[PDB]
Each structure stands twice: as C-alpha cells, then as structure tokens.
Amino acid sequence: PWSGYLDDVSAKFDTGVYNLYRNAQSNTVKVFKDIDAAIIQNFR
Amino acid sequence: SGYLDDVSAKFDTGVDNLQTQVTEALDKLAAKPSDPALLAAYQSKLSEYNLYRNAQSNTVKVFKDIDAAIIQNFR
Amino acid sequence: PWSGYLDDVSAKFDTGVDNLQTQVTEALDKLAAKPSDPALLAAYQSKLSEYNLYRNAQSNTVKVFKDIDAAIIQNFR
Amino acid sequence: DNLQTQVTEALDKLAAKPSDPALLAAYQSKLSEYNLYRNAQSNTVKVFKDIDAAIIQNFR
Amino acid sequence: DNLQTQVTEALDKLAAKPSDPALLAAYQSKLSEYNLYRNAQSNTVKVFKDIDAAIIQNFR
Amino acid sequence: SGYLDDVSAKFDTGVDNLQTQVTEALDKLAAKPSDPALLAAYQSKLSEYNLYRNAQSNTVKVFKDIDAAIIQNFR
Amino acid sequence: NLQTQVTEALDKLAAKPSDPALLAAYQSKLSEYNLYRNAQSNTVKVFKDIDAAIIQNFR
Amino acid sequence: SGYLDDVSAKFDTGVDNLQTQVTEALDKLAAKPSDPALLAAYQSKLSEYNLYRNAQSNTVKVFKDIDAAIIQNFR
Amino acid sequence: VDNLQTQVTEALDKLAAKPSDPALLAAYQSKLSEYNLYRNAQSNTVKVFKDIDAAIIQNFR
Amino acid sequence: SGYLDDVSAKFDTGVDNLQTQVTEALDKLAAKPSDPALLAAYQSKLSEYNLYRNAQSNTVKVFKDIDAAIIQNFR
Amino acid sequence: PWSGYLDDVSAKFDTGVDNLQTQVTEALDLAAYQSKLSEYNLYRNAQSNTVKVFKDIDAAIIQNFR
Amino acid sequence: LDDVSAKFDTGVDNLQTQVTEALDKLAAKPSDPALLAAYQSKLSEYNLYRNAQSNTVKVFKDIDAAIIQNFR
Amino acid sequence: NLQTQVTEALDKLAAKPSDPALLAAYQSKLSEYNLYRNAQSNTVKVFKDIDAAIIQNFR
Amino acid sequence: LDDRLLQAFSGSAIATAVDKQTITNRIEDPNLVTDPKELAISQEMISDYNLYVSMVSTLTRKGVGAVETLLRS
Amino acid sequence: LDDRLLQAFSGSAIATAVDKQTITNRIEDPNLVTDPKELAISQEMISDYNLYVSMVSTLTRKGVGAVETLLRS
Amino acid sequence: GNDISLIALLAFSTLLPFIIASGTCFVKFSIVFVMVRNALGLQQIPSNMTLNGVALLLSMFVMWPIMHDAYVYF
C-alpha cells in the first residue's frame, strides 16, 4: 500500500478519535492541496 | 525511448500503488455515493492523483527547454 | 554540495520561522485527538494561516530572481 | 559536479512522495539553479568557439 | 527507424481517446523527444557540409 | 492535401461521431434546459468536444515548427 | 493549384470567423502554404548561387 | 491599394455589419443595463466582435512573414 | 512614391488622435506593414544592379 | 533633433493632456480610495495611458528596422 | 534615500491616508470598527495593482532597447 | 563604454542594499501587510534597473564590434 | 551633437530608471545614435577602398 | 622524408574519420540526444572537429602558395 | 630593436590566457552564476575579451599586409 | 597554445616564402644553374621553371633537419 502527505494528516483523525470530525478533516486536507498546487505552478 | 521517458517513469514507478487505488476507490463510491466513509476516503485519493499528474507534466516541459537551447548552439 | 544564491534566499525564509516549522504539525496532532475543542480549534486556525502565506511568499520570490538572472545570461550569447 | 548529482537526488525524493509541501519547495530551487548554469555555460562556449573562427577567417 | 514508427503509433491511440490522461502523458513525453532529435539531426548534417565547402574556397 | 491534413484527420476520424452528438444534445437541452437528466448528458459531450478541439490544434502546431526549422537549413 | 485552395478556404472563413470547424481547416491550409512558398525561394537561391560561383572561377 | 488590404477587406466585407451592430447594441444597453433580454443579446454581439479582430490581425501577420522572406533572397 | 508615402504618413496622424481605437489600429497596421516590404524590396535591387556595373568594370581592369 | 524624435512627438501632441490627467486622477484617488465615482474614472485614464505608451514604443522599433537595413546596403 | 518612481507612486497612497494605519489598530483596541476595517482593505488592494501596472509598462519599453 | 556600466551604479547607490534589508525584515513576519507592500515596491525597482542595465551594454558592445570589423 | 545628447540622456535616466517618460525619451536617442554611428563607419570604409583600388590598378 | 610524410598524412586522415563517425553515433542513441549531460559534450566534440579541419586546410594552402611564388615567377 | 616583438607578444599571450580561465572559473562557482551582481560583472568581463582579441587580429593582418606588398614585386 | 598562437603561426605562414628566398641555400643553387646556362649561351632553355625546380628539391635535404628539430621543440 501507499500513503502520501495528505493521508499523513487525514489518518491522524481516524486514529485520533462527528460532523466536526468529518468537516474539520476535509477542510484541512483540502487547504494543503491549495498550498501544493501553487508551488507546482511556479516550477516552470 | 530516451532520457525524458526515464524521468517521467521515476514518478510513475515512484508511486505504483495509487494507479489502482483510484479505480478501486471510485468503484466503491459509485455503488454508495451517499456514504461519508467512502466519500471522505476518495477525496484524498483524487486530490493525490491530481498533484502527481501536474508535477509530472511541468517537469518534462522544463527539461525539453534545457535541451532545445543547447541544440541550437551546435551550429 | 553546490549551494548557489537561490538556496540562501529560500533558507532566509525557513530560518526566520523555523521555530514554527514543527509547531504546525504539533497543533495538528493535538486537534486531531479532539477536533471538538474550541480552544484547540481556534488556535490552530491562526497557525495554519501563517504557514500558508509563508510558503507562497517563499515560492514567488525564488521565481523572480530566477527570472532576473535568466535575462542577463541571454545577452552573453 | 555536485549540482548535477544534487538535482538527481532531490528529484528522487519527489518521485517517492510528490505531495509533501516541504519537499516540493526544496526541489524548485535546485531545479532553478540547474537550469541557469546549463545556459550560461552553453552561451560562453558558443562565444569562444566563434572567436577562434573569425581569427582564422581573417588570415589567409 | 523505430523512433519514427513508435511516434506514429502513439498518436493513433490518443486520437481515439483524446480525453484519457494515461494516453496524454505518454504522448507528451514521446513528442517532446522526437522534436529534439529531429532538430539536432538537421544542424549536424548542415555543419559537416559547410566544412566541405570552406575546404574548397581556400583552394579555389 | 499535405501531411498536416492527415495529421489532423487522425483525430477527426476517431472522434468523427462527436460532432453529430454535440449538435444533437444542444437541440434536446434547448427544448427544456431544466430537465436534470438532459443537463448531465450535455456537460460530458461538450467537454469531450472541448479537449478534442484543443489537443488537435497543438499537435498541428508542433509539426508546423519542426517543418519550418528544417527548411531554414536549405540555405 | 494550391494558391486557389488557400484563397478559397479564406473565403469561407471570412464569412463566419466563429465556426471552429472552419478554423481547424484554415489553420491546416494556411500552414502548408507557408512552408511550401518558403521552400521554393530557398531552393531557387541555391541553384542561382551555384551558377554565379562558377563564373567566378574564370571571371 | 495593396494585397494586405485585400486580406483585411475580406473580413470587413463579410462581417461588415458588425461595425454598426456593436455600436448600436451598446447604446441600447446603456438605457437599461438591468434588462436581462438586452444583456443576453449584447454578450454574443461583443463576443463575436472580439474573435473577428484577432483573426483579422493574426492572418495579416502571417502573410507579411511570407513576403518578408522572399525579399531577402533577392540579394 | 507619394501615393504610398502619403498613405503611411497620414494614417499615423489619425492614429495619433486615438491610439486606443481599434479601427484606427487595424487601418494603420496594414499600411505600416505594407510599407516595410516596399522599402526593403527596393533597396536590394538597387544593390543588385549596381553590383553588376562594379563587376563589369572589375573584370576588365 | 532627428526623425525618430519627430515620430514620438506626434503621439505626445495628439494625446496632449493624458499625461496630466493621469497624475490628477491618481492624486485625487489617493485621498479617498473608497469612492466608486473616482475608481471608474481612473480605470479609464490609466488604461488609456497604457495603450498610448505601448503603441508609441512599438513603432520606433519598426522605423529603426527599416533604416538599419538600408544603411547596411551602403556596405 | 534613493526613492524611485514606483516608490513615489506608492507613497501617494501612504501619504494620502496617513492616520488610517493607526486608526485601524487603535480602533481594534463594532459599527465603527467595520467601517475602518473596510476602508483599510480597499486601500491596500488599490495600492498593489497600481505599482504592478506601472512596473509592467516600463518592462515593455526596455525590452525594445535590444 | 567602460563607464556605461558604472553610470547606473551611481544612481542605484543605496538600492543594492535596501532590497537586502527589506528581505531580511520580511522574513521575520511574512504576514505583516506593511512589510509586504513595502517590499513589493523596492523589489520591483530592482528588476527594472538590473534589466535596463543589461540591454544597454549590449548595444554599445556591438557599436564597437562593428567598427573594428570595418577596419579590415 | 548627437553624442552629447545621448551622453546626458543616459545620465538623466540613471537617476530614476523606472520613470516612464525618461525611458521613452531614451529609446529614441539610443536608436538615433546607433544609426548615425553605423552609417558613418560604413562610408569611410567605402572611400578608403576606392583609393586602395587605384593604387593597385596602376602598378 | 617522404615515407615519414606518408605516416603523418595517414594518421591525421584516420583520426578525423573516427571523430566524424563518433559524433554521428551520439545523435542516434536516444539517451544522449535527450539528456543535457550528454548534449553538453556533443557541443564541444562538434566544435573541436570544426576548428581542426579549418586550420589544416588553411596552413596547407599557404604552404602550397609558398611554392608557386618561388617557381611561377 | 626588433627583438621587442618577443616582449610584446610574450606579455599579451599570458595576459590573455589568464582572462580566458577567469571567465571560466566565474561560471563554476554556484553563486557567480546565480547572483545578479555577479552575473552583471561577468557581462563586462566577457565583452572585453571579445573586442581585444579581435582588435589584435585585425591590426596584425594589416601590418603583415603592408610588408607583403613591399617585398613581393 | 592560445588564441595568439594562431595569428603568430598564421602571420608567419604569410611571410614564410620571403625568408626561404633570403636566408636559405636556395639562393645559392639558383645562381649556379643560371651561370651554367650563360656559359653555354642557351638563355631560352632550360626554362627557369625547370632549374628552379631541381634547386628547391635539393635544398630540402639540407634544411629539413633544422625544421624537424623546431616543431618538436615547440
């Protein structure tokens, strides 16, 4: 199997512990995508 | 085949479990799109598949720029 | 190693906030253990915000200097 | 040269986990530092190798 | 040569499914390689047949 | 009828039916833009037709550039 | 003759410059004409350069 | 008189109404910029006006480049 | 000459009144483009003809 | 003063007070950025100033091209 | 004290709205605060775009020295 | 010519340093808008200078090169 | 003279290389100076070649 | 004398013929044409060849020119 | 004395070689390639090498061309 | 070797044949054969293109040891 950095964080929640759990999890995972997507565009 | 195929396969060979996880995870949600347990999981895999594809594409474009410069100065 | 100039201008941002680099992942585990605590939940929002801007401000500047330098080294030709 | 070897290694870390925000930033630098050096060197050789051509075209 | 054959074959697959990324990346890589080859070949052939002229202008 | 017409036709012959499906879908949705089952069908067909037309153009452009880069060495 | 096809491809496009099915045809035809006409001028120069060089062996 | 005026004139004579159609449609909209019926009619008039002016200028540029080549080979 | 030299000269003076007006750009770009070719296509032939007279006089003495 | 100095002054004497108006609108706006009545005006003047300053520079670059080629045929 | 043209332009906004910087901080230490917070957000946004445009106009001209 | 380069440095005399001070201060609080807005200006002015400096030397480089070929 | 025009326009610009009006006024001078200096050198070459041809012709 | 000259001629002819082919083979191998590391050498290899043949055809003409000038006149 | 030619030539040769290598070494440093200040100083350095070598080349071509037509008859 | 070694070698190759005419035995050989032709009185025949031919060949055997010793030194 394989687990990237996004699941470095998401799995913390499943292993840490309801909608707050689900919503807070999803927003945090989503915010990191927006940080990475910026750098990938400066690559060029 | 050449050097550009090689640097791309580094990414592909570097993450070889995800190629299937996306198809498997998509199939679970297709049967039950209303279940958070599957929906929340799929979100992480789809977002991961996106970054892999973009970084893999921009990297190849930069190397073909370094190659196209030198080839002109052969004249 | 070959530590050029662009390496310093990146490290200049890390070394100015490096006390926070670990502090971000520390708060995540606390909150992940209890997402329903407002005291933890409100504090985390500030640290995550600071981390986002820090990374974007590093990456913009390390492009600009790549675009100055690449101008001058055309006129060598 | 270290710069050639140093980029090859930063690339190999990203190939393992391209989604880490800390790993991506590191490679962006080394990939920028590598692109300039290749260009500055290619131009300089072109310059020098044509001076030696004019200096032969002049005398016959 | 294989390269000319292998580039033609890759195009045909994408044309039937231009919306699949698994085929796009394969075409991006190969096409970006064929054009660098096909340019580098042209300059070299020219350069050798320029010497073969200069080598005559000295004696003519 | 040069080579570029054939390079393009390779896409049009495979996707040859897409022109007719998109034209048809526009007419069905236009009768009642509110039917949800009609909207979802059109979204995919219009997008599938978008990437088709874009990917075709860039391929002709790449050959246009290598072709001009050889001919300048006729001098 | 190739001159007429490119001209007439322009004549359909100029009447409706927003139909993409016509643009994709004109992009093709206008490119081919560009490469052809450039390839002829260079080739003529080469043949005219050889004939002039010969005369300078004697003249 | 000139051949590049003919290439441009080929467009101006086909969409010849556009020069006045765009001017008129704007004058109406300024009377009630809130009317949805006037806006929708204007969007397409302005959009069609853009694609024309670009396609006119790129074509003129390409024809100049062909002529600009032959004039060098006179030497 | 003035038939062409005037087309180029006066169209610029129109553009100077509204450099931001596209019909004045469109009607200008074509003339300024059409002028660049005429000046180049003249100058080369003046050289070519005068290069022959120099070669005829060179060839005898 | 030469010819390329004369070509430039043509644009400055046609667009005689745009340079003044820009500093005036900018000077007023800087005192009260929250007023929408000032923003709509300034956007027009700044944009218009841009195309003037940009159009000017492109033509000087074309006329020194036509000249530099002719003073080559002196050679 | 070498201040260039882009600094002279930026200084116009910072000199036209001189106290606002203290007012927003001082008003924090809510109807009044909302108006000051709103006025500050617009001021900073207008200042950013202006130096970008002037910076890009000049970068065109110098590209035609070549 | 040998003065053409130096002619730019004398106008830019401080600027080469101010960008270093602003960058070193920004790195301490990259979330302060008063520092970010200031830095954008001083950084932008450094781009236009370094670029406009390079294009000019290339022009004068080639005036000299041309003349010394006409000596032949 | 043209050289004194360029010389002082260059120094005037260096005081503020980000001013749009100073840049526009420098683009023309640096253009006009280049065309002058090339036109001049190319004709001096022409005149010395003419006298070089006479002195050989009468050997 | 002459037998010593035949050797100097023979050596140079072969050394050139091997270099001409050595370069061409770098354009067929795809790991060389598409890698900047291997391209940077090709630009030097292709440059050094040009200078050698250009110099050898200049001096040998001037040698010939020095014989005509003694004999012809 | 015409042995001056040996002094002028010997000085110029060494002075040139030093500048060729210095330009090269200014490109092998990881920051002499990547700092604008140090790039701009390499542009002044690389212009001068080109003009100096070309001046000597064209002046010496004339000087020999004067002695040619003196002696030939 | 350096850039300046080309122009010194190139400049020498331009002036080469004047030294061989004025600082080499070829001057001696040339006169001797013309002196013979005069004694016989045959000033048309043999052609100078013949006498100057044999003379440059013979001089080669004499001077060659000095040239080989030099390029190997450099």
Structure description:
- This is part of a larger assembly, with 13 copies of chain A, two copies of chain N (73 residues) and one copy of chain P (74 residues).
- Chain A is mainly alpha-helical.
- Chain A is 82% helix and 0% strand.
- Chain A is elongated and about 40 Å long.
- Chain N is mainly α.
- In chain N, 92% of the residues lie in helices and 0% in strands.
- Chain N is built from three helices and no strands.
- In chain N, helix 1 (2-28) runs antiparallel to helix 3.
- Chain N is elongated and about 55 Å long.
- Chain N starts with a helix and ends with a helix.
- In chain P, 80% of the residues lie in helices and 0% in strands.
- Chain P contains three helices and no strands.
- In chain P, helix 2 (26-40) runs antiparallel to helix 3.
- At the K-L interface, helix 1 and helix 3 of K face helix 3 of L.
List keywords for this structure.
part of a larger assembly, 16 chains, A: 44 residues, mainly alpha, 2 helices, N: 73 residues, 3 helices, elongated, Surface presentation of antigens protein SpaP (chain P), virulence (chains G, M), transport (chains G, M), protein transport (chains G, M)
Classify the oligomer.
Answer: part of a larger assembly
> End-to-end distance of chain P, in Å?
10 Å
Helix-strand makeup class of chain A: mainly alpha
Proportion of strand residues of chain A: under 5%
Number of helices of chain P: 3
Largest sheet of chain P, described in full? none
Shape of chain A: elongated
What gyration radius of chain P follows from the Cα positions, in whole Å? 17 Å
Number of strands of chain A: 0
Principal-axes shape call of chain P? elongated
| Main sheet properties of chain A | none
Terminal residue distance of chain A: 31 Å
Q: What is the N-to-C succession of helices and strands of chain A?
A: HH
Keywords (chain K): Protein transport, Secreted, Transport, Virulence
Organism (chain K): Salmonella typhimurium (strain LT2 / SGSC1412 / ATCC 700720)
GO molecular function (chain K): identical protein binding
Family (chain K): Belongs to the SctF family.
